[PDB]
Each structure stands twice: as structure tokens, then as C-alpha cells.
Amino acid sequence: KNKCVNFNFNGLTGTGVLTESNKKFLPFQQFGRDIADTTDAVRDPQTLE
Amino acid sequence: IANQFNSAIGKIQDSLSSTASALGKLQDVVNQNAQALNTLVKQLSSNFG
Numbered sequence: 001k002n003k004c005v006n007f008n009f010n011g012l013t014g015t016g017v018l019t020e021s022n023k024k025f026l027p028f029q030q031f032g033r034d035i036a037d038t039t040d041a042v043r044d045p046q047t048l049e
Numbered sequence: 050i051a052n053q054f055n056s057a058i059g060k061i062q063d064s065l066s067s068t069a070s071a072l073g074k075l076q077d078v079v080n081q082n083a084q085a086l087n088t089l090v091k092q093l094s095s096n097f098g
């Protein structure tokens with residue numbers, strides 16, 4: 001967390017700082033998106049947050 | 050003549066409190082930039098075939 005990284009979630013590769021989100025995704029949602037259609041936020045596949 | 054001028058400046062207080070309608074010319078300019086920035090941002094979602 002809080003460091004810039006080459007992340008990859010389930011094949012969703014990218015560059016970013018990662019942080020804990022107050023955003024509450026539904027169980028059917030694994031990813032979120034920007035108005036620009038970039039992957040904004042992610043639900044982690046091993047720890048459900 | 051001073052009472053006319055002082056009255057007339059008094060009416061500018063009321064006009065500029067009550068509405069945006071006169072400043073709409075500056076509103077149009079900031080709004081056009083916001084619209085164009087948001088368009089160039091939304092075009093990132095274009096799949097282009």
C-alpha cells in the first residue's frame with residue numbers, strides 16, 4: 001500500500017499507488033471505473049476488501 | 050448628481066446578488082472549457098474498432 005507499483009489483479013495489470021477504499025462494491029462487482037473508462041478500484045481476490 | 054450615482058451603484062448590488070444572468074458571458078467560457086476537457090477525457094473510452 002501507499003507506494004507506486006506494477007500491480008496485477010487477476011490479469012488487470014497496471015501502474016499505480018494502491019490504497020484502502022471507503023467505496024462499497026456489490027458482491028457481483030470486482031472492479032470500478034473512471035469517467036474515462038480506466039480501472040479505478042478493485043476488490044482483492046484473497047482478502048475481501 | 051452624487052445621489053444619482055450612489056443610487057445607481059446601489060442597484061448594481063441588487064442586480065449582482067439576485068442572479069448569475071449578467072455574468073453568463075464568463076460562465077459560458079469556463080463551461081466550454083470544462084465541456085471540452087470532459088469530452089477529451091470521455092474519448093479515452095472510445096474503442097475505435
Ligand SMILES: *[C@@H]1O[C@H](CO)[C@@H](O[C@@H]2O[C@H](CO)[C@@H](O)[C@H](O)[C@H]2NC(C)=O)[C@H](O)[C@H]1NC(C)=O
Binds near residue numbers: 053
Ligand atoms: C430631476 O429628477 C430628480 C430625480 O432623478 C428629481 O429629484 C427628486 O426630487 C424630489 C422632490 O421634487 C425628491 O422627493 C426626490 O427624493 C429627488 N430624488 C433625488 C435622487 O434626489 C429632481 O427634483 C428633478 N429636477 C428637476 C429640475 O426637474
